[PDB]
Subunit: 231 residues, 5 copies
């Protein structure tokens, strides 16, 4: 009931001691309980990934407790302060890096101008576009990010067919988005023609800035809309 | 058994007290029970998302009870009154908004004319068509909606290939439809040619009204058919 | 052990009474038991969707029992008598209804001629082809049907691209078929050219009869083959 | 422990008797135990599909036991003797049967010549290529087969588009392969042109023999490789 | 608590003895415990695939124990020493083997030159590209590999359409990647034109070396990046 909180977070593990006591590690402190039903409750919570809150006056490793709060506290991964202070993960392929960097710089500059520094952008590098969905899924499952942006330049090199990889990447990004319930913005673009001539390079080098600005606006709007409909 | 109902709804959490009593939060009131088997029953119901109905004369927080109704009551999310009074969620992209707004207005006007105000339409904005499947999935899991409509105008801009995004959006909408068992109507249209000329603008501006009317009729018919086959 | 059966079917709900007794609703009658281990057994069976059979002399609501048959009895949904007497669900879109009706009539007539009335066909209407996979999934999960047939006419109208919807519908029908282990026959056809001229109308109006006869033969053959390999 | 084995196999069902004893059906014999913890153990094993081995001197229905081996024994479905003596399931569509039969005969003859009769081939008929993935999935879950081969001839008839069905069939075969962990060989072929002329018929009639020989070699190689990497 | 470790690993099976004792096989030694709650704990850990560590002075089969470590130890499959010493699995199809061998040799030579022998490459053979996703899924689930590379040469033979198989293979590789959380590099290439002439053979024979070097660099970079973001 009424007792100051000591630890709050997902159960790392549930241990059984020699004295028929249930030792459960919550947060940075290990605590043990002597209630037999609490053993099954903590085991089920750990199995189902349900967080518990243990409040006791002995906030130390190995301390005893008898009152457990099973109310929602995050159930594991989770982060975020206020509503306009969050983080965004930017994943960029390293093929045609001089063009993707334009979009990245435009995105970062526009976010800084709009939010005034309340939104933080983290940059991650991958070899190619095929590596983006798995990296996005790995980053999304840790919480810590309100949105994820993937940037790549997939072109037809004139030797091998390129549509298979682009289709797979787009489908995988959509699948990760639906799986993790975390928005994923797509800046993976496939031009109709790119013959690596001087004229082609300048055009897309200039256009990726506009693409980055559009992506920044879209990310801000979608995060705000999700926050609003989340009541 | 025979006892006036106090609370009815999904179990928010199941708490263990110091006196070996099981505190379960159902509805807006917290109640506790002293039956050891009821502890396991409530834990399993919460784990499997099975709703319970607790009836007692002490309809207040912390009250005691011994009789629990495990009959179906919604199992969490759920809404809807009668059969012709429901709600529809309309999701519209903001690219080429002047054309999509025609379909939205036609849809709303036709629904108002047909149902006479019994059906309510709620409008949600997303940056682009790529953001529609996740928004639809998020809205579907809350109940509260008998159908979901997604409207977008995906065109070929003459610079980048556009079929990947359209394919991903259609496939994702179908996947969400199959996952959540909630109908999703598609007003995501891809014209053969759109060169942003004056002639092209007027034609589709006019055609989206017909598209919206067709979507309204389809939504009404599909909701009625699902209600009928649900016995 | 040896006791005449009273109720056989899936457990609707498991109720705990004030006298530490487990009340379980099987079939149309509610019964209660006083075995503590039977409480956990029935709870697990309801959680895992495992049917139980309760045989007792008190075949009435609220009666007591002690012997439970946990042998396979259907595990919920299930229907079917003999091997040549089953039911088929026919789902038809309402776009170009005058052509789809030809296939439906041919299918019904051929089934009546072949089986002699042992096979029953039920007709369900949907607005368009996009609504077919969800309706098929909903109908398949109730048992009651040995096969499902979906009929639609998806054409290129000359304004919007149509391949996305056709691909989504075919993939969704395949996914539902693999998910529910119920055969789904496809009569969703996309012609190379259809310009709504008089010549085009008559040709497909005539061809859909042959398509329906072929679908009827295929459905009969596949149902017989599945029955045979099911040992 | 040390006791001669009586029955070994998956638990068909777990029954509770009137004398607080747990009756479990393993293999062709029904046996009961009086250990309360064994009741929960057997219930969990049946729920999770974990096989148990019951050894007792009373190898008869209704006999008692107290020692249970929970070591891996198959967990349900499973078959196979030695490493070069297995079975293969051949699924053939009945469209253009005169061409598919060439591949089937070539496959069977090559397998007989190579293995000398150690490998057995079973033939299953389906109406069309659309029926292959579900049949393959149904056959795979029974064990009893080290590989599955699907043969069909999908052509463009000049009236309706055919790529949707071929794409769905190939994707479904891959999905079943990944789901059931059973190799599925593809002999579903789509020619560039087939106008049902005399010249076209002979060419593919001759080529399907080579296709069948290639499929036989591939099946043998893949089964051997999986056996090798399975340690 | 404080006791030297004896066995650490996933629970192979949980056995119940005649003396109401729970025998659990961890690692290469079998041990039994007399704690009733430990029986349920070990059963749940085996069901959920949660590893346990048993530390006792009787490090032998059939020994007794009372203290169990439930802390994370691998939960089953898992391998890897340091951060620059890992293993890579190379899967190569046997169609056009003389071209794929160039990529394999280039990959191995570049890895040996870069890592100096700290990274080990294992080569697995499959009949065709269609067999790659299942082999990759089987190899990934055993741990033991930080990345998987699939190499194949899918060409248009001029008789049958080839895009279905390539699309299925790429999609399946992406699906396995997302399922198993193990990176999968794609060296499955489809040229625009390959007419088996002398000129075509030499060009791709030379280009596959560059492809292999690129794949080696990409694999090293992605493994390092995943290790870095794993904190």
């Amino acid at each position: 009931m009424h007792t100051p909180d000591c630890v709050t977070g997902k159960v790392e593990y549930t241990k059984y001691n020699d004295d028929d006591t249930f030792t459960v590690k919550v947060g940075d402190k290990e605590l043990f309980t002597n209630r037999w039903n609490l053993q099954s409750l903590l085991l089920s919570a750990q199995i189902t990934g349900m967080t518990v809150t243990i409040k006791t006056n002995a906030c130390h490793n190995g301390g005893g407790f008898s009152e457990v709060i099973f109310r929602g506290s995050g159930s594991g991964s989770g982060s975020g302060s206020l509503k306009t202070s969050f983080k965004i993960a930017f994943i960029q392929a390293r093929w045609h890096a001089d063009i993707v960097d334009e979009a990245r710089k435009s995105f970062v500059a526009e976010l800084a101008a709009k939010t005034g520094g309340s939104v933080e952008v983290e940059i991650f590098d991958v070899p190619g576009a095929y590596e983006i969905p798995l990296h996005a899924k790995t980053l999304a499952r840790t919480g810590r990010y309100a949105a994820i942006v993937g940037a790549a330049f997939v072109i037809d090199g004139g030797i091998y067919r390129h549509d298979f990889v682009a289709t797979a990447v787009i489908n995988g990004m959509m699948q990760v988005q639906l799986e993790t319930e975390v928005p994923v913005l797509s800046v993976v673009l496939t031009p109709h023609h790119f013959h690596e001539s001087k004229e082609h390079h300048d055009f897309f080098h200039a256009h990726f800035k506009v693409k980055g600005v559009e992506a920044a606006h879209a990310a801000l709007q979608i995060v705000s809309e999700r926050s609003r409909i989340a009541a």
